[model samples]
Target chain A: KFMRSDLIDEAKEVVQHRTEKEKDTLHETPGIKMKEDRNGRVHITHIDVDESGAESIGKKKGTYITLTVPTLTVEDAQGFQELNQQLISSLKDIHQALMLTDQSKILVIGLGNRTITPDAIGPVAIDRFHEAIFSSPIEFGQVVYYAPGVTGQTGLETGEFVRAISERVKPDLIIVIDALAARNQDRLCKSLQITNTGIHPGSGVGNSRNEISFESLGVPVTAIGVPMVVDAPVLVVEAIETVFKVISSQIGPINVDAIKPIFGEWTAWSSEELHALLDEVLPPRHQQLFVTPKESDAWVIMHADLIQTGILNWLQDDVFG
Target chain B: HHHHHSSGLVPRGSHMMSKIKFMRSDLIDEAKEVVQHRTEKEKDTLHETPGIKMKEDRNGRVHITHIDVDESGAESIGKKKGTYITLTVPTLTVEDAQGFQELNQQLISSLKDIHQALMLTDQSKILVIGLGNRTITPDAIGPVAIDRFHEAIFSSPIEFGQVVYYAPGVTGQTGLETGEFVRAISERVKPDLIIVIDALAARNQDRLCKSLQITNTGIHPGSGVGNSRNEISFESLGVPVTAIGVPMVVDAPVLVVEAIETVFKVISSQIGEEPINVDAIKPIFGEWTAWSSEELHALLDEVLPPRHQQLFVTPKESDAWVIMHADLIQTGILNWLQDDVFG
Candidate 1:
């Protein structure tokens, strides 16, 4: 409904550009490493608000690990397995980075609505972990998962629900998984983003809710998810840019001053000017729409399955420490 | 990718919606005459590019224009020799059945006029293509309209013009070039004419999910939404092609730019020029008007994080409108075909 972004890189870019002085904020959080294999590019980037000034940049303090497969799908068994291994390794890395003990009671919160197919990742992962957690030893520091649903479904703040559960369970470590919104359509469902920046239940969809981070929950929190939806406005801007490219190429080098009257009026206008015009022209109803690829529903299910498998496999191996 | 401009029918205007302009071959004479009218006393260079022709119809509904974009003219706008017909009416609403009917009738007549200009006979074979991602509601207009296409011509014993309809899913789904796919079909069908229906992108929010643009020039299959595919046009397919589409979406950066501008303007207005420290506000609200759209676009291209680059917007109520839009266009086509008025 409103403009928002979950990508730390995006936030950093805007913050860096808007200010006059250059800020050195990007740092490799301890335990973050990236190794490339034949399957695709897998890397981890961690930013601590205290260490990297991420809060000032608008990205919460956290470790973010990204798995990028140029062409990953449910059909690619080998690639899926490789990604599973990477995810497990990353989770192990996250645990050490957050200094969680093997006996730390773990609470995994699945944040989103199951009714919405693209937003079902959180709940789906919970279901998969639920099956895995039940079969494990009870003395393995008590692992419990919950799907709080969204505010619309429960008529209560998702954060409040999670906080109540956290207090009752008093888990030492919280891992929240949910669907994320990406600025790029190509990134949708093709990649996974894991962060120590605890989830903001509705931020991905522009419906901001109460914060559910370490500061709010009084416990270390790690978030994991895949981008499932992209806003329509971002796509249109790219399309126009494409058109601009074609026109500029077709015209070749010309006198910018001479052409001021005809095409320059539009060609020379900046983002600010266009943004101003749109604010007047665009109605509130138009702002509410978000888009995803047609195959988003299937991708969500497949990715959720992959993430669940990765977590369960790691747990079965007893690699929590 | 170097899109085949020769084959692609550009949707009647530059992608920038703020100063939208169209160029058509039919209005060439009027365009030249207008230039002459303006040049009577003042000598100005309006050379290689073709002159512009402008006309407004009685209903205050339709406006026609022609322009040349050769070396002498404004080639930077990507003006090709073609006709862009824009028909404006009260926004179609689901509750306004009468308004829908009236607009539907008007649309059919306009379609007929274009058909006649293309010299399509009642017996002419027509290959109609619905271009878009059917899975996405706003982009599904072409495919949806194809569902209601009068395939009766193929089945009927009566010899009206032959019509064949196909909705080649976008490249993402099919992994085939849209232009190549259409060409393959056109080669086999050898239809007299090709008509493409698609969902287009608009720069202005008002045009989004509102206006229909019909052009004789072919279209770049995925150009409207930032994806550039091969062009499906007469030059490429060996048959004249006509494109019809409604601007159903807006570019995200364009929308953001508008919002940012509004914020700055409001701030500037609230703080009177004399009293406010202009220098203090300059950095936050940069001198936007000083730069051209192109410069701003370049800045955006660089400043925006890579992920924020490719975004588009459709109306929240796009699902209902997508289906209704498809039916409305379908009914218009059927009316034009049934009525011999175009001839």
Candidate 2:
């Protein structure tokens, strides 16, 4: 109810850039659906992209999916980075797709070079908070953290990180983090990708790194990312959308008729822009509050830490103490 | 002392002779009779070295005790030299391992048997094993497995309603030395079935498939393999135990046999002839992986699923995974066995 339509419209314009290319089949599968309704208890909403496609929706080869549960509690609204019950419930969607168990440990590895502006989400997020897994009596034991860099270099060799960690930590699951490249002009900040096929760290920068996942490491891994950059090709589509907008604005008297010959009456955004706009408008007041990649990691740490803390605290309170 | 010297009882100072000797004194035998006829309590007072018998007349208590000081090799009490009672128990000789290697077939099947024997009526419990290095050798497998197994088994009830009693034991047998080691480990783990594993030695050419022989004779933790210290088997340690083993390396002949078998199998199969199955080739050929005899056989059985019981060769990683998963399933069954206790 407290939504800003003008901002929503701007975001819609941003996402439209990506959608236009899908219509033209210039890039890949350009499917996105956005709808808002007072469907259930807590401001229900959903965004499903390319539900019927076996091909890449963008220059990126694999699929990207996401399910976000908007904050429905006052504490969450008050800026507690921990996920509320709503967000935890939202994981059910991804859980269904992945077939995860309650004992399943989710490892969210944010892949990026924190030093770089465009590649800062992974490290920035990791530095900010904690993963909340309880240590003793009465706890939902889980250990979630960020793998700050790509698989090859510093900490763990990507291929065996999961195995090594699981061997030591004994988790029943895992998750990975990395940046993704988009094929839209306006969708950079607004679009987020969630995929079931796991992830490769730096594929967004034209430097498609080796993939690190369950198939490779003998353990399951999930990838979560937001598009921060558009490939050079999608920028051209943005150029096309801008031309249509200018033409529609110039033809006043018979504006619709005047522009009919050259550009058709199609929406003016590309796949990239559409994704950005979709992610933006879906979250109420999202433009003003959208978490950057770095911010998301910070949020992830605080969130996971809260859960782990809650569990561990309850453990000590119940047993050893 | 005179009676002991005369009764044909060899003194610790002169007990090294393997040949028989004749005694000339009947007084020694008579004194031994006097000692034997004395009450157990009176004997204890007379002979500081408490004899093995019931002293119930004095305290109505039977002391069935086993003394293994001499077995400790004099090093137990930091002594350089002492009476070392080296007693080798009778060993069972299995004429044909191939003909009677029933338990060595499927690891899961063996696990099932163990589960059946250890399970409770309706109470759930877990058996957590603490593996690795009271000394050396890759010291991570048991601890890691135990931690995860405990997590999975205990957590099952909260999420799946499985009952559970967990086994918590650590294996830190310094070298092959396993007395205090087993006692300490057992103290930590009160398990239904104690599964002990350590490196072992094999003289058989087929080090992987043709060597392991399970018998009632207690185990020596790291003895046969290399020269570890000394170890105590389940019987010696007083527990119902199953053992898991993986050979780290092989003797020269064993290695040579393994290589020959692998090459021969390859040549035979390539030339349109069926290569020797591991079991068929083990005694003559040998295995590549240093898996124990039971593990090797179990691996063979896994090559072909029950339905497709005839087409396969090497073991798949997924099959190993399945076997491991079966272990978890057995854990669940154990928990279900004690459901009432858990409930």
Candidate 3:
């Protein structure tokens, strides 16, 4: 219950420092980064990728691309063909380059709680992919399996689940798909994160449901995800700070009571409403919270959807060669 | 929100909630009786050995020191005491954890101090050793602390310049000369700082929660738990070392004894009893013979009426399960530290 006065004052100052002009230009940033390393040791470009596509936080010898994939609904297949094509192409490039021509099993892990629709990434993707590749014998390359990567129902943890699955299956490559929480609205769609190294599920959001990656699973893995939700309180606080910064920049020194009015009004915006507002103001790809057109929305949730259409376009061009 | 429920503790949707709630309430009742007996033992002890006292802050945080060491070590160790502080940035707040940076700073400078000591002595390699068994809850602190640290760069080419390896001294599985683990690691990769972690017995129950104390004096991994691991501390390893540990588990027996005293006090407070000749509630409460949640609750239910028996049964069962599950997760984290994921 005790609030530190100094912390409050510091936070207030930080808000006041960021002007409305700056807020107006605020754009969603992804954590993915790609840089060339001319040197020969490890001889890999620094393709740093994060959810926000932000600057690289660490140094690893691998190709990493952090894409903020907007949720493409299943219905809008034609509209997002170009976007999906490019994203899928990039993913394929990473996969082909990373794996040796020798045979390898591809493990695409779907991570999410099936019960919650918003958190349906793992279960939904698992069903969709399984139906596609397993039924018929179309040289579907290696294998793909679903280890719902352990939720509460399976008393086993996600790390243990992945480890156990990896031990049994021993796939050469693994692809993990999960519901991701993106801080920025731009990354709502098919944020295809392709890396030669593999993936760490639930690292960004604070809830670290057991870590599973290439290192943990022993097979080279790639993580694919779409951001689904934004923390509501975090958004509210951000908006409040934005308004205060604008107000503070225009006028000279402002009193606590003066800023209080704006804080009172701005805190009312819901996370969903903010996303909608962002859609109106932000770029096309960066509009929604975490869905690609083909996944969730009624208008776009099918193979004939925007996400699939775009991916197919990319596949057609690349495979044609 | 706090006022909505009587206890104000509602079920959370998180995975931790169900496991917590499933504890048998009857067992909690019996456990309460058990705790009472322990208090009686404590009260009956001789002029007690000097023990550390802990004071809880307003927000459930604690400040502490044992009978001997003053608050200096507590204050110092409370700050982050290592070079590499790796955490999911989202989980940390700069305002709250600035002190940790200071600890990191102090640790960086300590490297030079150790280097100076080595220059004087004939020792060539200073082992950055971590002591403690991963299987036991409290002793697992060393491994947990190591997990969040920056490992790839710890003995960087420019830093150690020699060699480095992760040497987690296993407490169990002896006959391997105990020192064999450290020696094997030393032969493989020479270290400069031997960092060890093991559980320390605390005078107060509060210390059993979260208290990380650093000691140049190496620790016995299972000493506090009454089970000592094959000792391979600083002396055995023949290197300078740092040990960091946080208390994880409380003695289950002592908790049971505390429960007995509490119920006795409650019963003695009632006026329905004839002018109570009992000097204290201890005599009657001690006779209740504490049992685990399941056994105590069923027996009490048979003896007492419905509602009261239910009350006793629910809490004890719940608390035990909560403690165990939480501890298990902590254990899982330790297992993760040594996991192939990093190494």
Candidate 4:
């Protein structure tokens, strides 16, 4: 499938290779579950994928958990904590799903370009992990963190760098953190995905590189990602929608399809479809452009803190006991 | 004290983060300036493109580019007459007080430059206008900053230099031209100096939500992101204006062109020089050559669906970002004012 989505739900919807529906579990792994809290401040979607369905969806077999808070912001520490607590619980679930013991060693690889703020979530998250290691050594057990910058910054491939490091430490689990791309504009920095499927660096922005996973590194790789960017075509699609609204309001009702000549094939496609189409048709320079919200700089930091805190709280409970 | 005359001299700022660059305010006029500048060096190589001057400097992780656009220079670059101070940083993390402080200093220094240019003394009465929608988070920087300002001018008994603040809500709320609203206020208060703050539009992906620009020339209300309303400047109001803004959103054309540029860079690198014929792509896009920004905007305007032409987008966390920046700018302003009056 040409479908590119970092979200398990979206990916599953697009893949639809399932022979059955409403099943609690897909193969040995649990299927996606959605629930809201009492306050409705947070929404959780848990999707577990196994080898049976992984190849069809192009995602590796893993448990994918997503936490969505529509109104969450850095200003509300309490709200942030609520999300973090959910993440901690999710991390524990992921730990058990991966069948890792409390004493198991973990190697976290923060991937992305630190120089680019939108892509810096991975590196910044690593910095937060380091802070946790020093702040409370017992919070995590035998966990080492490394930030392998993107290919643009470092000439070596990110997967190769992780592989070399994994060979030395020989950790029980490999956790890779990165920023992801989303088709929806509203999802940027508002959602996080945790999966045991590892990651393909820069895949989100149409710049797919080497894949880092258990097959490549000889260890299970759990990938944690937050959607931080949307490409230009998606934004243009949104603008077109807005224009339609604007035209309908200001002038008489006008059919958007009437202007197919102006938009070309884009008018007939969904934002995601248009995005993929643009990738194929547009020049390379156009395909590479991605946009993030202005608050991305601040959210990058906030996201790092939330993920780091979740890991610490989830891992620390084991050490304290 | 009011040598209030139309100086035609507006100070402008251009922020270039990564490869993207754009002016915050005074859109059409500045674009004209760049157009004029480009026309002068039509035959010159891009490296020697006349009119637009660029200087690169680094302070810590922040990179600064000071672009000076002249009247003739505006033709080629699509900018106006002004000195644009652009600041770019790799990543802005939370709880990075050191980074914030550094940014604060840079902002204050820029403010000081504005003060010096206007030849204002410590006792100068300053009128600060926050221009933008109070409700829209991305466009709320101006109004929010005004809310955070220490308006000692109205209440403080001490002889603190007069500092008045106003957030003339956008035309949607005020039902009046933003320029007329400010003009009416300017006639009454008649301050010695004016400082305008608002959100801006980014021309490139690198700059979207990650950069700030400061200029001495006055700003056009709602001009940055293309919902341009009315001109607000020394020409309209008998006072010199210093405009400051950070890009809170990115418009469609800018995003499209940037994406094109990125692809061009990548493909060109992979295939070597003259790898692909420029003519193979749309001629309107100009085969990786020096194309005027006006020309680019026009081409995009022609191709893009009408609704998407000037529509811009900001991150979902726009509220928090706007609040944080407002606090930073307010703090910087208060510190500068305190030192100026007391030091």
Candidate 5:
């Protein structure tokens, strides 16, 4: 309702927007389970859902795991190493949870457009991933990488193209990596989420895309994605209110409830109405713009390394080349 | 550093992998500087090597240098035996319309020369391969240039030429060898000549995006990124491979050497003394500064943070800057590929 968010963390927040105590008990909802833990600066949020939970939360049934790091800088050797190891550990967990055997052929597909800096996470990681060899079998399974360019580049639906590749490669498991959109600006490039369920590519950007999940492709799907962009309309509302608070600082502790009466209640506006106001304020040239940080390229590369290295290390268990 | 070293620039302590040869430059013009610095010669006369022939000319804004290296020259100065054409301009990152228009003309003319030199006729079928990691801005020159080949030439008159373009995601991205992929395609299409577009690593900071190197000899793939792969040459692909590229990124240590050069030049200019002995600048470069030309190779190793070895430096706006050159390069290549198909 606030903005299109591919992150299950944000979705859970929307579903349980209440007191801390209320949220603690809210995990008892039918067919839903939540677990939270921390590893140094890396925060982990594990949420499991079933059909009943899907009906209640309006999301598909799958286990969604999100890892949030305080920073995404490769320059910090300690932090970067910790993040990489944690990701590798989580990926190992994913294979076990899916009950996939060692013989399961894995095809890791990076789904995004490379030209756009913010939407380049998928290709960047795939570009950084290790070589996948399936000519002969390994102790584990053979792993491969493919960054299928966006639909705009290839003029083909992403899901359909992936399904075709899955048929040819015949992978027992499909792990999709993509750049996700976030409702909160804070989560951009700082949070990663993996799910056992398939992903809808443009759904977060409001493009209700076809699913590339197990149900659609026959093989089980595991999506490992990081949020790289934040919705611009949401940021606009956020920025305006921040300015209002700064301007009214002379009045001393101006409450939001009192200030909303003076304005047009923009704080409570729906996403559509907010976008309608944005249309009036912004020109047609800016209609398609997504807000990203200036250093997002570096951030994307840093995070891409973590994901690529994690998956690369996880896929290979033996010492053979 | 050559395997059959004819006693040109061999290390004092002989070894298989000599530490003295750290200039990772593919451009022959810069390779000449390393040879010059190691051997005894002045700047102007350094271009006078036994097996190396050079022709220098300037067409308005573009300063062009053609370095033709023979078998002996390749053995002497550690560069491949081929025709390397370097086009140096002010800087491609500028928005100046007139400079770009002039540069585009020079680029097209240079490509025409390469076509004539390689004997790629108008009827020849061509496979143009763009090789690089596309997501990384500095390494994305190939994919960016290939974007230009899409629309205009697709439905152009079939009689002009047959050009098929592909951007093979590098070995790391595709989990397949780039040469194997190219070989598979070459076997399928059976093209006569192949043109490769790539982003090269620069030895000097000024060369980044400003210098375009077109070579008849094939390139060492992933050299710019330190991920060396199978060579995309006639020896491997069985087709004449003409490589065209711009230096989009320079190694971080190269920047340090440039800064050291800045220090030396600044110190030299300030001195009232004549252009004197080589050892005169012992005070200027600090301790261990005497005979500083060799770890000049290894000097960069001890330059800064340990991660400096793996880090590549490009400007902030390099991604957008690459696109600017991408369009110009795309236009120039297409113009030469068709070779008067339109006009």
Candidate 6:
């Protein structure tokens, strides 16, 4: 409601919410092609947005794969194994598309402040990664990891840090892992968005920040987003909607064009109207408040475990060898 | 009020029943603090307690506390019999090249002294075990230190006698006890000396990241944070064990105690600002404030929900300090092994 999400699936809500009933597949729009596959514990949505579609959806024209572990986080023992297998397979596809060989030099750029918890997924994921600079299996590629802190600390652009780094390192590809904001707090640590269009570290459309990609690094970039932050307004708005849903679902189907009896026209207001009220009524820096969980440290470590292992598995057929 | 070694997970009064209670710390110096804090009147004989020996030395900015606790001291203090050394460097968090180098040299010299004190030969085989779950920030000290140690060792040539590095994930991950993991590796590696690195819990907030403990008694991973496991020590593993740790967190109750004492100090000063205040207030407040601080601490233990004490407090600066201390251990170990492993 306040700002667009870095995730294409969430951003798509703007275009498809009023005009779309929210079917996973079959995009009738001009510039977007979409597909969906849902099995157990894991759900996948693949959307290809063209330049025209990008204009409509406010997202870059590229392939976006959203993998959602929507349920049973950390509690399910088998959950991690299944997610790992899926991630390994997906990473292999991206690796092939990038034309990366087993021996290719790969530089992994972890973007964020390691000292900060919410911004730590990138740096923490780097912990479990296989640093091939010193040693690895026979067929594994040479992989190096670097975390260029935020602008405030380094006083330099993130993309610029990688530019100078990749200039000499000259990796065949660049893989960037950073935290993203979720529209719903439930999606925090649950949704993993992988894209080939590169990432801008944040959501502003014209913020003078550069996206790290082949366009800038002169190499194909595979960006993975681990959403750790949720906008304050989005949470407030979602909570407002949830109250109506829960109350209405318990009783019976009520007219949404206008909520009756419960709270008069206030609760009956359209989603757009409610968001407008929340965004305007909210105080300054309300938008600045990117809320993460109190136990975000645990969540970061848990997600990073999958990502680092997934990246390692993607780089080789047999990790043991 | 309750005293040391409560025979449960927490100290003072655990409310629950279990063995190995009261306090869990790898630092013998801290154990002394616990004993010293308890029974305030017998302070003189406390340090002279039979079977316990302690000494202190200061170098540059590093203040060292050396303690040797034997079988009797172990039983008395509820700690294992071992030699424990505490290196307190108040300037650890300060950002300065000179400070960094000075502490590095200080630690380097200390580690070398420990190696000699252990009665080990020059070419003793070494095995370094980085204990703790890498995913957990407070527990990641061991794994992170091992990461830097690995990089430094690999980047340069190491001609030193056979040295092994292993990051045994926490016991929960593999459905195996941490000791069993080390036991299995100890047999395979058959090293003469094993070095253990992990994190510790402190009662003092300032000690976090600002202090380091080196002990010959080995370590029980997670004991410092109220999570218990069988220890990996010389007796448990065939080889002698040396543990090095940095305090990364403080139990919530510890912080509560700190709060009360600090508030009491401030309140007394405030009341003492004018004359008649202490004398007039003494009779009215004597009922509670008159009790020993330990009684006040014991009262906290009584009122706190059993699990409430489990919550830990780590300084925000710890995120960087963790990496900082890890680097310290890495370069210090490198310096210790430099004579044998030359590029």
The best candidate in terms of TM-score: 1
Per-residue lDDT over A1-321 for candidate 2, one digit per residue giving the tens place of the 0 to 100 score: 111111111234325644654366444234444443332333323444443422323222333333233442223543332232333444345445555444555454556765445555554444332322222233433445544344322123444534544444545455554555554434443423445446654354434545665566666555655455544433444566667778778765135466756876444434456446555455443322221344444443444343333223432333223
Cα deviation of B63, candidate 1, in Å: 9.1
* Chain B vs. true chain B: TM-score per candidate: 0.73, 0.36, 0.42, 0.74, 0.84, 0.81
Q: What overall lDDT, based on C-alpha atoms, would model 2 receive against the true structure? A: 0.37
User: Taking chain A by itself, what TM-score does each prediction score?
Assistant: 0.79, 0.51, 0.59, 0.80, 0.83, 0.86
The window of 10 residues in a row where model 1 chain B has the poorest summed lDDT is B21-30
Lowest lDDT 10-residue stretch of candidate 2 chain B: B18-27
**Relative to the true structure, how large is the alpha-carbon lDDT of every model?**
0.60, 0.37, 0.38, 0.63, 0.69, 0.65
lDDT of 1 by residue, B145-227 (tens): 88767554445342444767888867656667888889888999989878888887664465555556666667843455544
lDDT (10s digit) by residue, model 6, range B1-343: 5344222222434333222333355555655444563343354554446766766688878887777778986777677787777788776654655666776777777676766755555566689888866655666788898888888876766653477888886665677888998888889889888888888877545566777788878885446544565788888876888888888766655544544344334445665351123343344333333433344445445544343343455553455667788888888877777653232
Clashes in candidate 4: how many? Answer: 36
Report the error of model 3 at residue B177, Å. Answer: 78
Q: Give the better candidate number (2 or 6) by lDDT.
A: 6
Among residues 3 or more apart in sequence or in different chains, the pairs in candidate 5 whose N, CA or C atoms overlap within 3 Å are: B295-B299
* Residue B180 displacement (Å), model 3: 80
Q: DockQ, per-model, please?
A: 0.11, 0.02, 0.01, 0.04, 0.10, 0.04
Candidate 2 TM-score, true structure as reference? 0.31
Which window of 10 residues has the lowest lDDT sum in candidate 4 chain A?
A28-37
State the displacement of the C-alpha of residue A11, model 1, in Å, after optimal TM-score superposition: 9.3
Model 4, A44-86: lDDT tens per residue? Answer: 7766665665665566776677788877766877778888888
Sorting all predicted structures by lDDT, with the top scorer first, yields 5, 6, 4, 1, 3, 2
Instruction: Please write out the lDDT profile of model 5 over residues B1-343, one tens digit for every residue.
Output: 5343212333444322323344346566677444453343345454445777677788877888877778987777666677888888765556766667777888888777766756666566777878778778888888767776665566555332367677766654333567766675666557888888888887667777787888888776445555465688887878988888888777777677666666666666676641223366666565433323334545445445778767788878888778877877778877766554233
